[PDB]
Amino acid sequence: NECLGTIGPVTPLDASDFALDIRMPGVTPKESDTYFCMSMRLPVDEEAFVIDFKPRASMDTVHHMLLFGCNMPSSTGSYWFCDEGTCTDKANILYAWARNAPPTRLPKGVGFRVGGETGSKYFVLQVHYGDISAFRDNHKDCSGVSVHLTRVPQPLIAGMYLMMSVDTVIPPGEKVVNADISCQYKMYPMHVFAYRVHTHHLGKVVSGYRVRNGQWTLIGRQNPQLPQAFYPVEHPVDVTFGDILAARCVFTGEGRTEATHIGGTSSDEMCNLYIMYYMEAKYALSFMTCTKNVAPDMFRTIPAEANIPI
Template sequence: MAKKTICTLFLLLAVVFVHQSNCLTQSQINYLKQKLNERYNQVGYSENNIGFEYSASDTFESDSKQDKQEEDTNEIQEDDDDDDDNDVHVINVDIRMPNVQPTHENEYFCHALEMPIDRSVFIIGYDPQAEMGTAHHMLLYGCSKPGSRNNTWNCGEMASSNDGPVCDEGSKILYAWAMDAPSLELPKDVGFEVGGDTGINQLVLQVHYGEIGDKIKEHFIDDSGITLKITDQPKRLSAAVYLLGSEGRVPGHSTVHMESACSYEHSQVLYPFAFRVHTHKLGKVVSAYRIRNQQWTEIGRQDPHKPEMFYPIEKNMTIKYGDILAARCTMVNDMDKTVFTGATSDDEMCNFYMMYYTSGTLPDIDNCFRGEKFHWKKYFKNIPSDASNLPKSKEE
């Protein structure tokens, strides 16, 4: 009887020890907060590198390895007893421009924040600290190696003279913001895992300073950035962003469909839960779809001149092996000149960001870009007739 009691006590102690080993103590949390808020300000990294390259699959008609008749239901159930995201295990960490001073319009500045290397942590929310009169847009990247070891650097991917790219190695988009979009909180049990052995050793904030001529004359300094909501508690579901985009030109007095599409060739099932669109002045509508068995299901459709927040995807849907992801930006140019895609606010962009989660390893391909000669009608049937129409508001 005594031996049984001792064994029971030992098992209880083992369970307590395992639980504590998976949690940070308060002193560890304080240390983590201190380390994450230290600015990454080493100098001397001078290699001349190019920005990250876009890759895309050229295959469109792959047979699905999943049951073609399976319904789009989310098979991953929430744990109602999960209270990991309490205040004890969540900290707010700032990544903000350290008082930069742009000297001309359409500059891109980058600033890096080092992640802990002994263990991973999880980003579960984003609170933007910027206003559209200063920052045209902001992007947060995860990098295995930043594009520079300077405190800040010029990092416009398409600019003619850069100090370096956003990332020198391992670029992943984690968040995007523009036009006074509000905060974003991820669904329960979902997080962007960074640090540790994830390959995301640095977070890099990129801020595009657009048409700010009046502010430049006033010699203003800027600290735009993002407050990250971070927890040490592991998340069952890993979040990531898949980017669809197009490059090309919009001739004067024309309407152009900039389109992209790629086949999803991974066994891991994706669950989209939010989307964001981005163009410059000529964009009228941005839409994206999942194509399965020649049937189109809308992922999201939005006016790019509305606040560029991540809008929730209200329908339950999945992305599976063999599905095709397709996006369109409808551009209308009433001017006499041709407008090309590029980095400045006078150029154009065509981007659709799909935020998703999955229960396993993240896919190694996270973007799909196409050029101006790519068009849906060359490859697909049943193209939705409303793909270039503004979505109806809930009040209509």
């Protein structure tokens, strides 16, 4: 979508609301599959709430876009290759836009808390230029996301529960390697409303579940090779103190002449399940993470769908 020019990136929507456009600074990808990053300091220092997102993506070149909240972008520059890093501190994903899998809106009354003393001070945008054909014109690109921010406190707060493997090793040619992740939930109840799966080329299926008294409730199941957008859940699933979140990524080593471990490059793998949730404002925490596997055995009871592709 058009570069903003003279009007700037901030549009007053009303006294309490305003839209902030986060766009690439007129960039021109010179190689296919370029990952460019840029940051935007929040205009206000006080706490605000992000209540909507509107993509401004060029349907041709842009493969996917991710918007994160953090306090220390990886670079002080205008833009930079994301392979340099997104955020020095923890990058809290807030939005993902995938080319052929349109994003779902946040439920109304739900917002991510930013700014203030504890929320993100910056937004970091990542734009993945896949096919850079339409860039021979050597035209500058300003794709991005328009965020709707409000100072009006939201009754439900959005957060992210990230389950990620750190130790997986996929022997070469190995037909099937599983990456199990599990943790006991120890906070106030959260309600999952969307999920996103992330894996590199060896990923076949990624599934996540709430396990309560031994029964498995599907949160989300997706083939990570399909566009990695946040997909809505079939039905809202509350996760409560006492429950255990379980996730499994099914990989294959076929095609690889060497072992593949967890890592950031395409020759490495990742097993990430982003579980987007909402919590009552007074009980809400913005992010939780599980990088462990506390109930290995429990996986003997994982639904068969978790192993069969989709």
